[PDB]
Amino acid sequence: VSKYGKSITEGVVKVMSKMGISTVQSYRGAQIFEAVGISRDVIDRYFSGTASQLGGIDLQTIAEEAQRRHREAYQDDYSKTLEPGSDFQWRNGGEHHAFNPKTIHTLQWACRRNDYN
Amino acid sequence: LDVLKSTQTVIHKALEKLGYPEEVYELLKEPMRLLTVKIPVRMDDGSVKIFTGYRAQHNDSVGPTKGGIRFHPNVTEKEVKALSIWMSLKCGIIDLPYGGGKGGIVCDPRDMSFRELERLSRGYVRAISQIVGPTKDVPAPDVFTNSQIMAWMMDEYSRIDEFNSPGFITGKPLVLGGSHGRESATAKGVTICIKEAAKKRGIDIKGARVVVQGFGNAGSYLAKFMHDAGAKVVGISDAYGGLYDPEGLDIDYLLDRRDSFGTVTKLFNDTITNQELLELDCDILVPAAIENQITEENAHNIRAKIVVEAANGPTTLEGTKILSDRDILLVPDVLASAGGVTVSYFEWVQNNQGFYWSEEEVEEKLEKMMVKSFNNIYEMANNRRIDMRLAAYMVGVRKMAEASRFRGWI
Amino acid sequence: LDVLKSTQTVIHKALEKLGYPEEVYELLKEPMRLLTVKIPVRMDDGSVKIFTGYRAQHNDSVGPTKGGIRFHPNVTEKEVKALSIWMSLKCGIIDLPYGGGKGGIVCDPRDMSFRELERLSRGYVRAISQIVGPTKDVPAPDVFTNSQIMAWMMDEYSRIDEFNSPGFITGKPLVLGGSHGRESATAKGVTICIKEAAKKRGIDIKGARVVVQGFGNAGSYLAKFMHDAGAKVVGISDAYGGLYDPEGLDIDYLLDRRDSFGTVTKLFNDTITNQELLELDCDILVPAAIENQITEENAHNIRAKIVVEAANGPTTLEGTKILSDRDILLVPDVLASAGGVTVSYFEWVQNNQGFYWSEEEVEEKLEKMMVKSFNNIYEMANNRRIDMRLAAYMVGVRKMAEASRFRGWI
Amino acid sequence: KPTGFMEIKREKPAERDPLTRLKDWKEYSAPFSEEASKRQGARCMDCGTPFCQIGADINGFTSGCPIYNLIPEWNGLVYRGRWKEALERLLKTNNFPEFTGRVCPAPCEGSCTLAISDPAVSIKNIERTIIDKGFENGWIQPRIPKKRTGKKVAIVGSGPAGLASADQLNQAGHSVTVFERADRAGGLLTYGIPNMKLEKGIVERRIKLLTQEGIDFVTNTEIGVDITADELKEQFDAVILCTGAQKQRDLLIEGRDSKGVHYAMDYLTLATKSYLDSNFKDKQFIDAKGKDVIVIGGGDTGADCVATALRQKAKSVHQFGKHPKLPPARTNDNMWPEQPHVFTLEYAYEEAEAKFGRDPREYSIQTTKMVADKNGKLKELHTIQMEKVKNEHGKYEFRELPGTEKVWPAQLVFIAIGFEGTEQPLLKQFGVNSVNNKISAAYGDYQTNIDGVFAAGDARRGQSLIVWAINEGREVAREVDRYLMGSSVL
Numbered sequence A: 001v002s003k004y005g006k007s008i009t010e011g012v013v014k015v016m017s018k019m020g021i022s023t024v025q026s027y028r029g030a031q032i033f034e035a036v037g038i039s040r041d042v043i044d045r046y047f048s049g050t051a052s053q054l055g056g057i058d059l060q061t062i063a064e065e066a067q068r069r070h071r072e073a074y075q076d077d078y079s080k081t082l083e084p085g086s087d088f089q090w091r092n093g094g095e096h097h098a099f100n101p102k103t104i105h106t107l108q109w110a111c112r113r114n115d116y117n
Numbered sequence B, C: 001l002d003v004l005k006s007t008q009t010v011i012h013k014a015l016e017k018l019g020y021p022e023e024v025y026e027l028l029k030e031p032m033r034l035l036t037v038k039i040p041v042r043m044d045d046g047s048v049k050i051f052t053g054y055r056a057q058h059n060d061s062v063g064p065t066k067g068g069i070r071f072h073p074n075v076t077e078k079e080v081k082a083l084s085i086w087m088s089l090k091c092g093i094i095d096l097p098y099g100g101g102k103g104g105i106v107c108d109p110r111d112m113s114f115r116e117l118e119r120l121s122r123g124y125v126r127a128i129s130q131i132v133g134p135t136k137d138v139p140a141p142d143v144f145t146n147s148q149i150m151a152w153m154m155d156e157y158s159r160i161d162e163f164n165s166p167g168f169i170t171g172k173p174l175v176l177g178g179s180h181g182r183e184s185a186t187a188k189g190v191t192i193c194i195k196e197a198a199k200k201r202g203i204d205i206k207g208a209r210v211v212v213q214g215f216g217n218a219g220s221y222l223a224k225f226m227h228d229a230g231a232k233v234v235g236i237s238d239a240y241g242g243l244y245d246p247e248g249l250d251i252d253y254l255l256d257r258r259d260s261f262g263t264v265t266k267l268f269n270d271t272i273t274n275q276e277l278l279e280l281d282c283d284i285l286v287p288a289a290i291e292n293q294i295t296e297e298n299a300h301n302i303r304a305k306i307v308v309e310a311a312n313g314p315t316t317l318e319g320t321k322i323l324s325d326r327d328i329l330l331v332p333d334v335l336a337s338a339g340g341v342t343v344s345y346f347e348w349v350q351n352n353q354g355f356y357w358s359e360e361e362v363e364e365k366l367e368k369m370m371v372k373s374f375n376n377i378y379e380m381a382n383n384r385r386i387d388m389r390l391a392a393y394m395v396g397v398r399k400m401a402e403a404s405r406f407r408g409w410i
Numbered sequence D: 001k002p003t004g005f006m007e008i009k010r011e012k013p014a015e016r017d018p019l020t021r022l023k024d025w026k027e028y029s030a031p032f033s034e035e036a037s038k039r040q041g042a043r044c045m046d047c048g049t050p051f052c053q054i055g056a057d058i059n060g061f062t063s064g065c066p067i068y069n070l071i072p073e074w075n076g077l078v079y080r081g082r083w084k085e086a087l088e089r090l091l092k093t094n095n096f097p098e099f100t101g102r103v104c105p106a107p108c109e110g111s112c113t114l115a116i117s118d119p120a121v122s123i124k125n126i127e128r129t130i131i132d133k134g135f136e137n138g139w140i141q142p143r144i145p146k147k148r149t150g151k152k153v154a155i156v157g158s159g160p161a162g163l164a165s166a167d168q169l170n171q172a173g174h175s176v177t178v179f180e181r182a183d184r185a186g187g188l189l190t191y192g193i194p195n196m197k198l199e200k201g202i203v204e205r206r207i208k209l210l211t212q213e214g215i216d217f218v219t220n221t222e223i224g225v226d227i228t229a230d231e232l233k234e235q236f237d238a239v240i241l242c243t244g245a246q247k248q249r250d251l252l253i254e255g256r257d258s259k260g261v262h263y264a265m266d267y268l269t270l271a272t273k274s275y276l277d278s279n280f281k282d283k284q285f286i287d288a289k290g291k292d293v294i295v296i297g298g299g300d301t302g303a304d305c306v307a308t309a310l311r312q313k314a315k316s317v318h319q320f321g322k323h324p325k326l327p328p329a330r331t332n333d334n335m336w337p338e339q340p341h342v343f344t345l346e347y348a349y350e351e352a353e354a355k356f357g358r359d360p361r362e363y364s365i366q367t368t369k370m371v372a373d374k375n376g377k378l379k380e381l382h383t384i385q386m387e388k389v390k391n392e393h394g395k396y397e398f399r400e401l402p403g404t405e406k407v408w409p410a411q412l413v414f415i416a417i418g419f420e421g422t423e424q425p426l427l428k429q430f431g432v433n434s435v436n437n438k439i440s441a442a443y444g445d446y447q448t449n450i451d452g453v454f455a456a457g458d459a460r461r462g463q464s465l466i467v468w469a470i471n472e473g474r475e476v477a478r479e480v481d482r483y484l485m486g487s488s489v490l
């Protein structure tokens, strides 16, 4: 527990150092995030001061997403295991990635053969 | 599960060593008055849940009884009786006019709210007001309990008795009539005990190497007192690690930077685990941290000449035997951690007298009591070839048994 | 072992039938104040043995508590709590201002001596004097207890309170301020109950055939009262057998020849066992003898229209079900054997008032109370399609639960 | 810092010696010991974007474990030494480890990242070791799903796909029944695959576990003439058609009428049934102890036929195949993302080479056959050499060499050159439509023309592997669960 707390504090300090705010007290008020995909109305209502370009999803969509996740997780009536993540690695059936094995080996084969098709 | 049986066994051993008959053991094995009550309570939502209460008076031959109160959700009758006997042993060791006792409530302060705790305490007093009074019982602060609960209890007992009784309950706020130094009592007690132990063993306090693992209020105040006295601190530890410096650690700076929790370790610096901290060279070691730390594996690695168990039973029987064989002085926790009881007694005396002492007077009286008790137990433990834990238990039981014999219950 | 669980289950059933929430069950399942004490005692030889005491107050919302005291060597906390709840049910059924309770001591009156019993009782009162008083508790006679012990207890409470309190304890000797008819209370209660049951079921009391197995004081007085009323007795039994005569048995002669024990069987004459006695033709059957007599085998053989369980649970659940199916009125023991409690209450009222009534006044008041209670329970049991035992338990718990709800503990 | 892939050299478990492999009908290999298994598991380098899990058709050949085994995860767990967790992770996805480990040809071994110029990690052997140790320790116990809703699915066919679908449906909570013609359930796993590969004790144990779950198999029900499709539909809501693919193509060449020519499937089924019945003492099988044996049609079927003939102690065995002998290493037109085509030398061939001293040779390739002999039994077989040549537009063509005619003595002959779709038009009681004897359906959404009829396994896949069958069974189980109850996570 102590090591996890220390590591998380070190990470928070690193994130602070990324921006340049050297005080947690200052960063606390500071809103240094840029929502990517949140509607302008929602940003003005709840995240005033945050920068958003494309607007995006709404409160109803966020609620629907949360409810879907909660319902699936509390259903979970088939197995006692956590599905494998796909944030930092590719696992079949997981989150799609730009460089999947299909694309990788197709590109390699085409490049090595000099074939255009 | 084994707490009551262990308490009974140690009491039996002490009585056997004293040589009194088995009647005293028969009388003292069990508390003489155990009360179980049910406290109605109203929640914020309006629903009513019933909390189970407890109260035990181990003995009152010496005089008025005393005991703490823990809002621990796993409090049971066996634990309550064991704690009552333990508090009686503390009182006997310190030579107070208290008999001993303990109370408790089955609840969860975590999910409980502020007003709900207020109502809970008030219902508890309304429930047990009959067998509780200035000459019968005296609550005191304990686990999940503090000055606000003490003040509510005092206010209600004033209401029910129709006259002010500040001496009814100890551990009150300063404005309500509390006693100064209520927070540094344990630190002062351990400071006196370490000083006297060093004097008796010949270790000069000036320049003595000290290690204090566990840097709560007790650890912080103990370090400050050691620095003021002159002894150098060569180790501190907390929930986030520890440090090490053979030539001091600037206790003034450490206390200045001390936060609310007492955490002191740096952020981007490696720390030393308590397991390796225990092995560091030092004259006196002061485990005031999680229990069950000194065991067989580290018994051969310990190096301190004096070990003070400020915590509650941090060691085990095997470690105690190994230390005794190695001839390392082991201060019993019963005597190490009696500062709280002593300051509570002083607070009660101040309330009864109606006049409040000062910090210097409290300091002098507390150190006098502690040095006298430690000298008595040390003399008895050297007169009889036994362990200091056995000497402490024997001395504590002596007063209770002898007072019972005078009063003629046996 | 199962007494406490059975009591809790029947209480739960009664509360469920009433329809109150589960909070009343949570509060009433367990007595609100159980005290365990140790009583020092000096024997004739000079040695000291410690007796374990007990005391339980099931509830005091209605008013002052009440309970007996048994010097039974196997008394335990479970039995004490069960008896406290049972006494509370009795008080609720009879509609008294009592809440309920019970005390006891772990000892053996057999090997105990006279002066030693005196000292034992006196030490018991000195032990539990704090939570016992005219507005808090009221001891009463019970198993292995009688007028001499009541008188000693009264004398000591007078000593400790410094003023006379004859109403402190019931069941005292006549000269000390007792109440007349203390010995025939159970007989009078069962006489009223049998009369009312016969009236309600249409069985004419004049010429009614009656069987009374168990010829102690209760049986003797019941037979005498039946003979005075007009009903003929066609069977009696005791520890040495029984008799049988369809046209009377000269109850006057039987009572005249009655010995100290109540044995009446001849010497050189064959007798009838209780098993065959139960089967004899009769209108009303009154088992006042060893428990566990009416069972499945004799349920089909029983022939009486009205069965009164003057004893404590002489029947079983299977027998009760069979009798209910056969449509045989079954008087609950709780109502059958409440004469002792009623006369004790009258004695307490007389002491509190300071003026003593007469036999006729006690007779009239007792019969009025008994007839009113029996009529109320009969009406409720006919309004709700249930067994009379369930009706008795329900009526008894109604008053306690409703008083608690008024007083706001829930 | 894992470095096993270069600091360790791939090894193999303790195999029974070939010279004694021909006497006892038992498993010819054993799993790794603890230390060896840990060392082999350490080789895998926590491979990011693993190529052992793609499981998709690539250039006409499979690559990666189709059932998506969490290969990196349980390899890491095997290395770490926690075995119950590895078993749990394996059983999360796979349902028949005891068959997949000791049957599957392991395309995952052939195609992964570490297979670039170096031996691959023994995924198959690690899986087999995990499952065998789990079974030995008895951690596997029936699940007995508490929840159950009255329904009825009547899976048909006891093959691996049918068993997987039945297990998934039973875990879902729908009662199922398995209709099978053969005496014992299992399908190919019982009779087709040899005792060598799959000792039937393990199959029987797994079927008993399924019965304990409550599958409630029914035997000797060809669900054709015996039971009509209309009654089956009326009595059961859905039907998972795991009908199998057992029709084998025949060589339309003159001379294939004389007695002696036999089918590989029928011969293997007869031999396995005889062994399971009375240790082949019933004398109701095909014997070749004193006769020559020739098998036509290379592949797993040919290997199994050769092994069975060798165990029957035939005097001589020769395997024939048109495809030219494979090269000894990767070629220009073959790459590691694709399943390799290197010389394999699996079981039943090294054993033949070792045992045969007079003729220590095998793999007679580049010629299949033509018109055989006549006059009762087979006396001789004619053969001619063919070579793969480019024609038209660089298209492969088979042209015979006129001067390479040869004669071989053959009295018993087997044909295992391939297989066809399901047994159609025999099972025309339903309205399903077939294109090339295979019932028509697409990967996912197996709902065919008639409601409640779902394709599965080789019936729609043509010829595939047990892992493919298991994947199809799981997917069709999910599809039918969604069709019935609408919502189902898996």
Ligand SMILES: Cc1cc2nc3c(=O)[nH]c(=O)nc-3n(C[C@H](O)[C@H](O)[C@H](O)COP(=O)(O)OP(=O)(O)OC[C@H]3O[C@@H](n4cnc5c(N)ncnc54)[C@H](O)[C@@H]3O)c2cc1C
Pocket: D103, D104, D105, D156, D157, D158, D159, D160, D161, D162, D179, D180, D181, D182, D186, D187, D188, D189, D192, D193, D194, D221, D222, D223, D224, D242, D243, D244, D245, D246, D265, D300, D301, D304, D423, D427, D457, D458, D459, D463, D464, D465, D466, D467, D469
């Ligand atoms: C290493 C390896 C080796 C292999 N070796 C062989 C081999 O030697 N021979 C071979 O043929 N395949 C072999 N295969 C292929 C494999 O056995 C099959 O592709 C697959 O197992 C069959 O799947 P299935 O679910 O259709 O099982 P199947 O057994 O095909 O399922 C059909 C089941 O239903 C029964 N059935 C038949 N007709 C009907 C009907 N009308 N109604 C109801 N039930 C019916 C069948 O008898 C059978 O029990 C091998 C595969 C691998 C990976």
Ligand code: SF4
Pocket: D064, D065, D066, D067, D069, D071, D100, D101, D104, D105, D106, D107, D108, D109, D123, D124, D127, D467
């Ligand atoms: S089933 Fe086959 S491909 Fe999948 S992991 Fe096992 S051996 Fe490899």
Ligand code: SF4
Pocket: D044, D045, D046, D047, D048, D049, D050, D051, D052, D053, D071, D072, D108, D111, D112, D113, D114, D115, D121
């Ligand atoms: S088998 Fe190959 S792709 Fe799979 S985890 Fe190991 S190195 Fe990576």
